[PDB]
Write a protein that binds this ligand. Structure first.
Ligand SMILES: Nc1ncnc2c1ncn2[C@@H]1O[C@H](COP(=O)(O)OP(=O)(O)OP(=O)(O)O)[C@@H](O)[C@H]1O
Ligand SMILES: Nc1ncnc2c1ncn2[C@@H]1O[C@H](COP(=O)(O)OP(=O)(O)O)[C@@H](O)[C@H]1O
Ligand SMILES: [Zn+2]
Ligand SMILES: [Zn+2]
Lengths: 474, 561
């Protein structure tokens, strides 16, 4: 297209692209030159300088900085080319139609459409840098689920992305709420039919988009109780053990492949979904520390063409066998030894998954800053699908929870009770409220300057009917 | 005020302290002497595109980007570039070749790209690439993949900058052939500047500049030092000054104690450099510029060459009229002679005549002695015939004086010289003089038209020539008052200039011997006639009769044809 592709993407990408991120440096004591004129040590440091990152204890390079590096590496202006897209998502599937004179793969292949050997290697750029939980309650309730039932859990985490000043051109995913799909949790694992999950999540995500959220990851708990007097949990995931066994890696790769990130610098228009997965395991001590991870782009394009399956060894992923419709070339994984030489080891029977991951830094908002949480809620109306526990959404709980506040007034108190994510979802599910009335409800419950909108809402006949039936109902 | 600066005020305007004291940069045009031509060329190529770009827009031309600058090491190339950069008062990005080549693979290209991009950001800019021969060497010598990668990166960046940009690139190298040839085409390092050894005035200026802070003694005769020092590049002069200071310190060490950490200030006040210190430094100096062919600066006139009046006027007509009066040649459409070859017995003073001719048109001079030609033939020398002619072109007008040409022209070198001569630009005023003692032994191919076709015979001096030579040689030597040399001249019929110089040297040696013996036994301010008489008695003609007869027969045969 005679230049860079034309498409509209997230605002974070645009604003990051506008910046250049150069880190200025002052006159070094080793310079030999007048005030003006910078020689080699006084020049600005590019944002992708690996030395700075590894010197500041940052293990990855804030993907946008990687994009800047790639653009600088080539694509001279005014001449030298007609623009070559610098980013391309690797694809391993055999070209079903090459036809230099041969027939399709099932009964014929040439050397031009043969998937070349794949060299697994740890990725160097992580798309999303910092995953941030707005409030401790959001995950405290989730862990309380396990406390009460004892079984594991699993839930998507909606939220939005923004800049992250602490890292060069870094991004942070702020999670606002957690929604628990219908799943059959158990002592050692959890199970859930994919069809129901996707069907439900389609409408749930539509409603969330209407509210201004977005599905930005999945969080599951892998916790076991220790023998100490208090509540302590073993640390089964450390350097020696497996950080993430095969199956969770596979599921994360599938999820990433199904949540592509739209980008302006690829032929297809997408690259390396901004999807973050969080796991709760417990730190070296008995705490309930959390963690974050993200499977690299090669693993993203590796699971799509099958080629991987779980192995009885937790820390290693099995490799499948060649067959029609699935061609699996030799997989070499590259590591580094203590002598500073890269070694390629063939691992067909099984290979560790440490080369298919990048780790993110979890955290919580500073407790001495402005509060921009969408929802001051999540300690109230029980969450959606806690049928296994006693929690159950229904008229009676609404009557017990959100009746006395509305029946009198005190709108300041009411607002916080109306800004609860699951409450909004439930009332929308009832379908009592009219579409536009619900739209103004969400605009009042997820936005400031809400006095007039809240008054209008309580004016609309829909809310009158809601409160009347709620009071009448036991 | 000056140096783009805007008692305290005067010091600030240049009209911890250690960081600036050791960083006394901003060396202006007052820190360079003896290179007025090269400095003027560099300033014209650099300042005007940056200071006054409007002229080029008005006329509608693209100012040259590259400015290659090559010369013998230690001649102040980097200092000159730094002075230009500071005086222009514009952004400039240093790049030292060894540093760029002393980094891990995959980062030298990054440094070069960053340099060029940054210089582009803050236009106007001046990128000074030092020791460019260390990052873009000749292809054959360095086949390393990384070197080829760096060369390709540099070429790409050089090509990609020539677009509405105010970036001027200055490069320094020892020889014009060391750099890869690909960096000497259109839109690249095309405009070249050659720096030659300074002359007497240049050496005097350099000594004046260096010896401004030193506490010189009142008995300093810098003129004598300039006259004595020949082939001294600036670095040699600086080392000479350092050696003189060290010698003075050693002489004054008798009144100082090594063990004591402190040194008396009164003793320090007595550190005065004397002419003796400079003479000792000259004794210990080791100049090396002449080891390679370089562009000199001759100043001989039509007074050191006696006789040869017909030859003098013929050379004037053949050389000066083209250079000085190209209008008439263009009017008549006559191509000036491209060279001339001198033949005759050795010691007749061919070199003096060639140097005088070169000085007449006020042009530089290049000397290529026979041993250097032989070394190039054996391939064990840095320079080359192509390099010699490239330097001649860059320093034009010039006179290239090939010496002992019979040694090589009894093959590869002869053919290469013929190629260089034929490919030379006829219009450009560059002349090739040749010296030989065996004109017949010279390869006939050289004497073809468009080459050293002109033949000039240099005869042995006559009585008047001998008298003139004796008078000239004894200018710097005292003689007995009222001493006549006509008798010596007539008694020395058939002798050559070398023989006369040997006679004078032997007479002076006897005089100094007598003076030393008398002083040791302890008066002889002059050289009495007995010294010259004995020297004449103890000298012999260096030319056998047979060679003279064959030379005159060959000359007569040439005349007859
Ligand atoms: N006019 C001059 N010409 C030459 N040298 C000079 C002149 N004036 C001063 N110098 C002194 O001569 C020496 C030249 O050193 P410089 O580093 O410039 O040499 P160079 O051979 O051109 O350098 P490089 O090969 O590192 O580019 C310095 O001592 C400088 O002070
Ligand atoms: N007019 C002159 N005629 C001849 N020789 C001279 C004259 N003036 C000076 N000389 C001396 O003659 C010598 C000639 O040296 P050179 O040119 O190297 O050898 P040649 O003259 O045989 O080419 C010089 O050392 C110089 O001192
Ligand atoms: Zn610097
Ligand atoms: Zn094919």
């Amino acid at each position: 297209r005679y230049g860079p592709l034309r498409i509209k993407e997230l605002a974070v990408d645009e604003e990051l692209e506008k910046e250049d991120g150069l880190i200025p440096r002052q006159k070094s004591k080793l310079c030999k030159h007048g005030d003006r004129g910078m020689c080699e040590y006084c020049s600005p440091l590019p944002p992708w300088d690996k030395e700075y990152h590894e010197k500041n204890k940052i293990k990855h390079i804030s993907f946008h900085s990687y994009l800047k590096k790639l653009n600088e590496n080539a694509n001279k202006k005014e001449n030298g080319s007609s623009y070559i897209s610098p980013l391309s998502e690797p694809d391993f599937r055999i070209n079903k139609r090459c036809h230099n004179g041969h027939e399709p793969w099932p009964r014929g292949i040439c050397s031009k459409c043969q998937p070349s050997a794949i060299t697994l290697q740890q990725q160097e750029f992580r798309m999303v840098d910092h995953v941030e939980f707005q409030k401790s309650e959001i995950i405290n309730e989730f862990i309380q689920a396990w406390r009460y039932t004892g079984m594991q859990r699993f839930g998507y985490m909606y939220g939005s992305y923004s800049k992250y000043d602490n890292t060069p051109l870094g991004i942070k995913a702020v999670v606002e709420a957690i929604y628990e799909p219908p799943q059959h949790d158990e002592q050692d694992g959890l199970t859930m039919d994919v069809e129901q999950v996707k069907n439900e999540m389609l409408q749930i995500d539509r409603q969330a988009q209407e509210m201004g959220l977005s599905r930005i990851g999945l969080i599951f708990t892998d916790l076991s109780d220790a023998g100490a007097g208090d509540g302590s949990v073993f640390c089964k995931r450390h350097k020696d053990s497996f950080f993430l066994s095969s199956l969770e890696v596979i599921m994360a790769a599938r999820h990433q492949t199904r949540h592509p990130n739209v980008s302006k610098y690829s032929e297809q228009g997408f690259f390396s979904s901004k999807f973050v997965t969080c796991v709760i395991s417990g730190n070296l001590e008995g705490e309930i520390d959390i963690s974050s991870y993200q499977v690299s782009t090669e693993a993203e394009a590796l699971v799509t063409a099958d080629m991987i399956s779980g192995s009885t060894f937790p820390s290693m992923a099995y490799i499948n066998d060649t067959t029609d419709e699935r061609y699996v070339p030799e997989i070499f994984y590259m590591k580094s030894n203590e002598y500073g030489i890269t070694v390629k080891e063939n691992a067909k029977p099984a290979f560790p998954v440490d080369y298919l991951l990048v780790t993110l830094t979890h955290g919580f908002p500073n407790t001495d800053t402005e509060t921009n949480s969408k929802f001051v809620s999540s300690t109230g109306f029980p969450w959606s699908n806690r049928q296994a526990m006693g929690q159950s959404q229904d008229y009676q709980e609404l009557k017990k929870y959100l009746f006395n506040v509305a029946s009198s007034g005190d709108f300041n108190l009411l607002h916080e009770k109306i800004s609860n994510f699951h409450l909004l979802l439930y009332i929308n599910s009832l379908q009592i409220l009219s579409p536009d009335e619900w739209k103004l409800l969400i605009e009042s419950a997820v936005k400031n300057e809400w006095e007039e909108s809240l008054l209008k809402l309580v004016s609309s006949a829909g809310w009158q009917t809601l409160v009347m039936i709620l009071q009448e109902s036991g | 005020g000056k140096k783009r600066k805007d008692r305290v005020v005067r010091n600030n305007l240049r009209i911890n302290r250690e960081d600036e004291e050791n960083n006394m940069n901003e060396v202006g045009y007052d820190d360079i002497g003896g290179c007025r031509k090269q400095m003027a060329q560099i300033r014209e190529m650099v300042e005007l595109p940056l200071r006054h770009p409007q002229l080029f827009k008005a006329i509608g031309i693209k100012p040259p980007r590259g400015v290659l600058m090559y010369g013998p090491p230690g001649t102040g190339k980097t200092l000159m570039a730094r002075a230009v950069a500071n005086e222009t008062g514009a952004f400039f990005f240093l790049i030292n070749g060894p540093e760029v080549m002393s980094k891990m693979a995959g980062e030298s290209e990054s440094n070069l790209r960053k340099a060029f991009e940054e210089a582009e950001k803050n236009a106007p800019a001046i990128i000074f690439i030092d020791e460019i021969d260390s990052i873009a060497p000749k292809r054959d010598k360095t086949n390393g993949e990384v070197e080829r990668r760096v060369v390709s990166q540099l070429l790409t960046l050089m090509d990609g900058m020539k677009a509405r940009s105010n970036v001027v690139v200055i490069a320094a190298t020892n020889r014009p052939n060391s750099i890869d040839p690909a960096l000497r085409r259109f839109g690249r390092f095309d405009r070249e500047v050659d720096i030659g050894i300074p002359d007497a005035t240049g050496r005097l200026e350099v000594l004046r500049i260096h010896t401004k802070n030193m506490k010189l003694a009142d008995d300093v005769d810098l003129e004598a030092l300039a006259a004595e020092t020949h082939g001294y590049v600036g670095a040699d002069i600086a080392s000479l000054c350092s050696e003189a200071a060290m010698q003075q310190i050693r002489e004054k060490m008798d009144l100082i104690d090594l063990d004591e950490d402190e040194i008396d200030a009164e003793v320090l006040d007595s550190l005065g450099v004397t002419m003796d210190n400079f003479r000792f430094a000259l004794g210990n100096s080791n100049p090396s510029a002449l080891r390679e062919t370089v562009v000199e600066s001759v100043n001989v006139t039509w007074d050191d060459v006696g006789g040869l009046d017909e030859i003098k006027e013929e050379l004037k007509e053949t050389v000066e009229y083209p250079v000085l009066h190209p209008d008439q040649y263009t009017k008549f459409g006559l191509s000036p002679s491209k060279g001339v070859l001198f033949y005759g017995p050795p010691g007749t003073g061919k070199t003096l005549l060639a140097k005088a001719v070169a000085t007449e048109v006020s042009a530089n001079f290049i000397s290529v002695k026979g041993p250097e030609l032989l070394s190039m033939w054996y391939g064990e020398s840095e320079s080359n015939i192509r390099d010699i002619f490239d330097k001649a072109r860059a320093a034009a007008p010039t006179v290239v004086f090939l010496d002992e040409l019979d040694s090589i022209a009894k093959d590869r070198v002869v053919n290469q010289l013929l190629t260089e001569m034929d490919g030379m630009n006829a219009k450009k005023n560059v002349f090739v003089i040749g010296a030989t003692n065996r004109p017949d032994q010279i390869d006939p191919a050289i004497l073809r038209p468009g080459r050293l076709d002109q033949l000039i015979y240099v005869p042995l001096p006559d009585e008047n020539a001998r008298l003139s030579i004796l008078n000239a040689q004894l200018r710097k030597t005292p003689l007995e008052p009222g001493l006549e040399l006509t008798a010596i001249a007539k008694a020395t019929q058939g002798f050559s200039g070398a023989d006369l110089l040997y006679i004078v040297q032997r007479a002076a040696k006897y005089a100094i011997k007598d003076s030393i013996e008398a002083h040791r036994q302890h008066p002889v301010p002059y050289i009495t006639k007995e010294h010259f008489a004995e020297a004449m008695k103890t000298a012999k003609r260096s030319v056998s009769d047979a060679e003279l007869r064959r030379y005159e027969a060959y000359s007569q045969q040439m005349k007859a044809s």
